[PDB]
Amino acid sequence: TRIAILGAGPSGMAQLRAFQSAQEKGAEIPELVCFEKQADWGGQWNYTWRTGLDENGEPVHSSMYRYLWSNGPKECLEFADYTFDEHFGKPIASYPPREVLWDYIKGRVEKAGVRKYIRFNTAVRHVEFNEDSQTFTVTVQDHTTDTIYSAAFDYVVCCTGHFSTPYVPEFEGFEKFGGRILHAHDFRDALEFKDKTVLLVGSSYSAEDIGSQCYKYGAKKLISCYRTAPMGYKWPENWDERPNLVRVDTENAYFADGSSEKVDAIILCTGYIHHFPFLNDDLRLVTNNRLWPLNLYKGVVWEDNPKFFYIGMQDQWYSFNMFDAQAWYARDVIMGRLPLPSKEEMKADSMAWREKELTLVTAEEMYTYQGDYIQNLIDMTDYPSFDIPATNKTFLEWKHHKKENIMTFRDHSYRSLMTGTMAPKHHTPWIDALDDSLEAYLS
Amino acid sequence: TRIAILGAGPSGMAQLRAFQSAQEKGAEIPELVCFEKQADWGGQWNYTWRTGLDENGEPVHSSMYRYLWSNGPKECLEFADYTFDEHFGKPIASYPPREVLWDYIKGRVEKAGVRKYIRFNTAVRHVEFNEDSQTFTVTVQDHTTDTIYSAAFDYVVCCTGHFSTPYVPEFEGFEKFGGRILHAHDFRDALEFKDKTVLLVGSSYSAEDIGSQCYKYGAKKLISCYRTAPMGYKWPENWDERPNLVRVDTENAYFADGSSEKVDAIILCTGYIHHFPFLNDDLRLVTNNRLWPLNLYKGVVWEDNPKFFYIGMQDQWYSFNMFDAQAWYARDVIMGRLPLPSKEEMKADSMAWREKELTLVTAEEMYTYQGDYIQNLIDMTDYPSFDIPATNKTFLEWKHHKKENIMTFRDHSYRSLMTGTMAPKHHTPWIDALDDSLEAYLS
Ligand SMILES: Cc1cc2nc3c(=O)[nH]c(=O)nc-3n(C[C@H](O)[C@H](O)[C@H](O)COP(=O)(O)OP(=O)(O)OC[C@H]3O[C@@H](n4cnc5c(N)ncnc54)[C@H](O)[C@@H]3O)c2cc1C
Ligand SMILES: Cc1cc2nc3c(=O)[nH]c(=O)nc-3n(C[C@H](O)[C@H](O)[C@H](O)COP(=O)(O)OP(=O)(O)OC[C@H]3O[C@@H](n4cnc5c(N)ncnc54)[C@H](O)[C@@H]3O)c2cc1C
Ligand SMILES: NC(=O)c1ccc[n+]([C@@H]2O[C@H](COP(=O)([O-])OP(=O)(O)OC[C@H]3O[C@@H](n4cnc5c(N)ncnc54)[C@H](OP(=O)(O)O)[C@@H]3O)[C@@H](O)[C@H]2O)c1
Numbered sequence: 035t036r037i038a039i040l041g042a043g044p045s046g047m048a049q050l051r052a053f054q055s056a057q058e059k060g061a062e063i064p065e066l067v068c069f070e071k072q073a074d075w076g077g078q079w080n081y082t083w084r085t086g087l088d089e090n091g092e093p094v095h096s097s098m099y100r101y102l103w104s105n106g107p108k109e110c111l112e113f114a115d116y117t118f119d120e121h122f123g124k125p126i127a128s129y130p131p132r133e134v135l136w137d138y139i140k141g142r143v144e145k146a147g148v149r150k151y152i153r154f155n156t157a158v159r160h161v162e163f164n165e166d167s168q169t170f171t172v173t174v175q176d177h178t179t180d181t182i183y184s185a186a187f188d189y190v191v192c193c194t195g196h197f198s199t200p201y202v203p204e205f206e207g208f209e210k211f212g213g214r215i216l217h218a219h220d221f222r223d224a225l226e227f228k229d230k231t232v233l234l235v236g237s238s239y240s241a242e243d244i245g246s247q248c249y250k251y252g253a254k255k256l257i258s259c260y261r262t263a264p265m266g267y268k269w270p271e272n273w274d275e276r277p278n279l280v281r282v283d284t285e286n287a288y289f290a291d292g293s294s295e296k297v298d299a300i301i302l303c304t305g306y307i308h309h310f311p312f313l314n315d316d317l318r319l320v321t322n323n324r325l326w327p328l329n330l331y332k333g334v335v336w337e338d339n340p341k342f343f344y345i346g347m348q349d350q351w352y353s354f355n356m357f358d359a360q361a362w363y364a365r366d367v368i369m370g371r372l373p374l375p376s377k378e379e380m381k382a383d384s385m386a387w388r389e390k391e392l393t394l395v396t397a398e399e400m401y402t403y404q405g406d407y408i409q410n411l412i413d414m415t416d417y418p419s420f421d422i423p424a425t426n427k428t429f430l431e432w433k434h435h436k437k438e439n440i441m442t443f444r445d446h447s448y449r450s451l452m453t454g455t456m457a458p459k460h461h462t463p464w465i466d467a468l469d470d471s472l473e474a475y476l477s
Numbered sequence: 478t479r480i481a482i483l484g485a486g487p488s489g490m491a492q493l494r495a496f497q498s499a500q501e502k503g504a505e506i507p508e509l510v511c512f513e514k515q516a517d518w519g520g521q522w523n524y525t526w527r528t529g530l531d532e533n534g535e536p537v538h539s540s541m542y543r544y545l546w547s548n549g550p551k552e553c554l555e556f557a558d559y560t561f562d563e564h565f566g567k568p569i570a571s572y573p574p575r576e577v578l579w580d581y582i583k584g585r586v587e588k589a590g591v592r593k594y595i596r597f598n599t600a601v602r603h604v605e606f607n608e609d610s611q612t613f614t615v616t617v618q619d620h621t622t623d624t625i626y627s628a629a630f631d632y633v634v635c636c637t638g639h640f641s642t643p644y645v646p647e648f649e650g651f652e653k654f655g656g657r658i659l660h661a662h663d664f665r666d667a668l669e670f671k672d673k674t675v676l677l678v679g680s681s682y683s684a685e686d687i688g689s690q691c692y693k694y695g696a697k698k699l700i701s702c703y704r705t706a707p708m709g710y711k712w713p714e715n716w717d718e719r720p721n722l723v724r725v726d727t728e729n730a731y732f733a734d735g736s737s738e739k740v741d742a743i744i745l746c747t748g749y750i751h752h753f754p755f756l757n758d759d760l761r762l763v764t765n766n767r768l769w770p771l772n773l774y775k776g777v778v779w780e781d782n783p784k785f786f787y788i789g790m791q792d793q794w795y796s797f798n799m800f801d802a803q804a805w806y807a808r809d810v811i812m813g814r815l816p817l818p819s820k821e822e823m824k825a826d827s828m829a830w831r832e833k834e835l836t837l838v839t840a841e842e843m844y845t846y847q848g849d850y851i852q853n854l855i856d857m858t859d860y861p862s863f864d865i866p867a868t869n870k871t872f873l874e875w876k877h878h879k880k881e882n883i884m885t886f887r888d889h890s891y892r893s894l895m896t897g898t899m900a901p902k903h904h905t906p907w908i909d910a911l912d913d914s915l916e917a918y919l920s
């Protein structure tokens with residue numbers, strides 16, 4: 035009895051870890067094969083200089099850029115089964131850079147020795163369900179041998195993410211503009227925009243942070259523009275918020291303001307689409323980015339075919355944490371530990387969650403909702419319960435720190451909820467930590 | 478009886494045109510469906526500002542950039558069945574810009590009324606051959622309805638090109654460099670590199686022309702580097718050729734010279750790979766870019782499954798011309814007008830062509846080879862024969878003009894081989910024609 039895991043990001047890693055933990059406690063687990071299109075694990079967190087299409091011609095997966103740092107409290111994403119203390123030996127600050135959290139998540143799966151289940155440099159092409167044999171045929175392309183083969187599986191868990199395929203709206207005049215146009219996804223070294231004016235379309239995390247990053251590394255000027263509401267923070271002297279872009283010139287941008295500016299480069303921070311080109315409509319999740327996509331029982335079991343699962347397909351306040359709660363749940367249903375109700379009951383449950391999701395107005399209500407969801411997940415499972423209300427509170431502080439000063443929210447520290455140890459302040463304040471390396475952050 | 482044509486570029490267009498011509502002459506043709514992922518036809522020639530992944534999340538197909546102009550004599554790519562005179566009403570110069578040749582190729586298929594066979598905004602996902610029914614199942618994703626469906630076909634003609642999936646080699650230090658790194662494929666407006674130093678890796682057409690374009694629109698400095706041999710032309714004052722790049726710094730490039738330069742942006746002009754993610758190994762052509770890929774009988778019929786065809790998969794001296802000769806051939810075999818020999822005879826014939834291909838040393842020998850190939854194709858077919866030796870000679874002149882001056886080769890003019898009418902000189906010399914529009918070129 036055999037399981038396919040699509041992707042070796044945090045969720046892929048989590049799913050392997052879940053099975054490995056059940057085996058460590060002495061259960062008999064199914065056989066596992068995890069397919070990954072990259073040469074190494076970590077999903078988003080595996081940095082690449084590459085852009086658009088990778089060396090094999092697959093879409094480039096990582097949206098991460100130089101100088102990226104955790105954008106929420108470390109302690110809100112700590113593994114309940116593998117603490118920051120265990121991995122690093124010492125306390126560290128609360129907003130580690132990319133390389134640092136990369137090392138962290140790799141650490142857990144290194145210790146667990148699950149790498150052996152992964153076939154790297156292998157792209158998933160197709161997943162089909164065979165009614166007659168009640169199994170899945172997974173077709174993949176191995177770019178090391180340049181071969182396309184397929185295998186049979188009893189269950190499939192999809193962990194391929196939903197922040198990689200850019201949503202890139204068109205604006206009148208883009209075909210005439212003379213500077214670079216790119217999506218947030220293709221943003222790499224902030225230095226390429228030193229001494230330049232940068233338009234940033236959009237009003238969410240990518241806008242906030244890519245702006246910040248351009249500012250931090252010496253851009254002349256920054257302009258955000260928003261579809262519905264303005265971001266709201268107090269931006270430095272050389273950064274304006276204007277209502278939405280409307281058209282574009284050989285060298286200028288034009289807003290619903292009626293205003294005008296010379297612009298060097300436009301970065302579309304307009305989000306991503308859920309895109310699964312390896313799935314047919316019988317298995318393919320279709321949703322906008324949100325806290326409660328429909329058709330997932332407990333947010334992970336595919337309602338039309340419960341032998342297929344999805345991990346981390348929700349919008350994220352929590353992350354690593356959540357994927358774990360999900361992977362532990364998925365594994366337990368795969369292992370027969372948690373039998374599924376009938377299809378009608380699944381559908382009714384999911385509707386109840388959706389109703390509640392529509393109730394949400396404030397940031398606080400939103401992550402508390404994710405919190406309740408995770409709470410419901412971890413109570414069903416092996417997975418160590420931890421203080422969710424206390425994690426909610428940490429998000430609340432984090433929100434405040436951003437409102438106080440959007441350029442110094444990374445300079446604060448919070449209490450781990452696994453160990454209790456409060457985090458030190460970091461040796462360099464954010465604006466001045468120009469070196470982004472593990473090396474430089476840990477010394 | 479039903480045919481699938483994958484792609485509506487020049488080759489897709491040609492294939493439709495071939496069938497339509499046979500019907501015009503009163504034959505009964507099969508049913509046709511052509512699938513195209515873009516919103517309009519023209520293949521490479523359909524310009525987009527987009528980069529990496531398109532609005533639906535498909536790889537962006539076009540490699541074409543602002544200010545692109547035909548890089549060979551117009552008269553070497555003229556349709557034998559739809560002349561430049563017929564389309565434009567008047568003579569024009571010999572190196573029309575993108576928009577101009579786009580209008581031209583669209584013209585022929587507009588006149589033919591074949592648009593009706595095309596399902597746009599539809600990406601081909603998979604082609605499978607069913608041994609039992611001796612038919613193909615083609616699975617596509619319609620991005621207008623967001624639906625994935627599949628249809629049965631008796632033959633399939635693949636026209637999806639091989640200059641879209643970039644070959645992008647890695648160079649030590651790319652992960653540290655602070656300026657933009659891109660493939661020729663993502664190159665759009667030359668203005669983004671005004672007053673900048675641009676490294677261009679590679680020594681072929683893309684290197685030549687992207688360099689030229691950067692120069693023409695005011696780049697500070699240009700550096701080409703070559704893997705095997707230097708391009709050879711006399712570059713302007715602010716452009717050097719040096720041997721291959723070896724590593725890269727925060728802001729510098731280092732070559733096998735031992736030399737060093739501050740660099741603002743690197744453009745990889747390292748070519749493309751034949752990539753068919755919608756085919757399994759039974760149907761998937763695997764080759765490097767060359768005049769004679771193996772496994773194609775007469776360079777178009779797939780030897781392991783002769784109900785599957787490939788158009789325009791060869792490296793190109795000739796182009797539009799050749800695709801026609803190929804499409805007409807493909808159609809005549811589909812229509813039963815040209816029965817195929819046994820598999821052993823096919824294999825033997827292809828070997829003879831390969832042997833001769835390996836003989837080739839000089840540019841002249843190379844396009845003369847393609848010429849002999851095309852000659853062999855058009856003699857079997859309906860397709861109007863035209864003067865190939867005379868077209869060869871035109872390539873020869875073209876070669877000379879490039880050797881004389883690589884910046885003014887586009888300023889000469891040549892004799893059409895269809896009509897005999899010599900082409901006028903163009904109202905503006907190349908270096909000065911800053912406006913790239915149809916509008917501005919034809920007035
Ligand atoms: C720019 C950016 C910054 C972020 N920063 C933070 C942060 O600071 N803190 C936080 O908590 N969260 C952050 N996130 C949220 C992020 O979603 C999670 O941290 C985490 O990366 C989710 O991991 P995942 O495994 O579920 O998906 P991913 O990390 O995207 O991994 C999916 C994996 O599937 C693979 N894959 C996809 N398709 C195929 C295929 N066809 N065949 C084979 N393999 C395939 C990919 O290669 C990848 O390895 C950020 C996201 C982005 C995009
Ligand atoms: C930058 C550049 C400049 C060039 N300049 C010249 C020139 O000046 N003169 C010249 O003679 N030749 C030139 N060429 C050569 C070029 O190969 C031909 O002119 C011509 O474009 C070949 O057309 P094609 O139909 O065979 O392939 P393409 O033009 O690439 O068209 C292929 C079609 O297939 C579609 N497609 C691909 N995959 C899918 C899918 N999965 N599902 C649905 N549709 C799909 C694409 O959208 C596209 O429309 C140039 C090529 C490039 C890249
Ligand atoms: N660690 C980091 O520093 C970091 C950096 C970048 C990203 N991230 C992560 O990446 C994920 C998503 O980031 P995201 O901000 O790119 O996607 P997102 O969270 O879904 O934000 C989508 C944004 O794009 C805007 N938008 C969409 N279409 C638009 C249009 N046509 N015109 C103008 N604006 C438009 C939306 O406007 P509306 O609000 O009106 O809908 C919204 O503000 C999050 O998980 C985040 O944690 C993290």
Ligand SMILES: NC(=O)c1ccc[n+]([C@@H]2O[C@H](COP(=O)([O-])OP(=O)(O)OC[C@H]3O[C@@H](n4cnc5c(N)ncnc54)[C@H](OP(=O)(O)O)[C@@H]3O)[C@@H](O)[C@H]2O)c1
Pocket residue numbers: 545546547548549640646661678679680681682683684686687702703704705706721746747748749766793
């Ligand atoms: N109309 C226009 O002006 C225009 C503009 C651009 C492109 N095009 C078209 O696009 C097509 C291909 O253009 P192309 O030049 O990009 O591809 P190409 O013709 O196949 O050229 C490949 C080049 O990349 C070089 N290269 C490969 N790997 C390398 C490496 N690791 N390091 C350094 N160099 C490397 C090769 O070096 P080697 O020589 O040693 O093998 C070769 O010079 C042609 O059909 C051309 O007509 C046209």
Ligand SMILES: [Cl-]
Pocket residue numbers: 058145146
């Ligand atoms: Cl362990």
Ligand SMILES: [Cl-]
Pocket residue numbers: 501588589
């Ligand atoms: Cl006609």
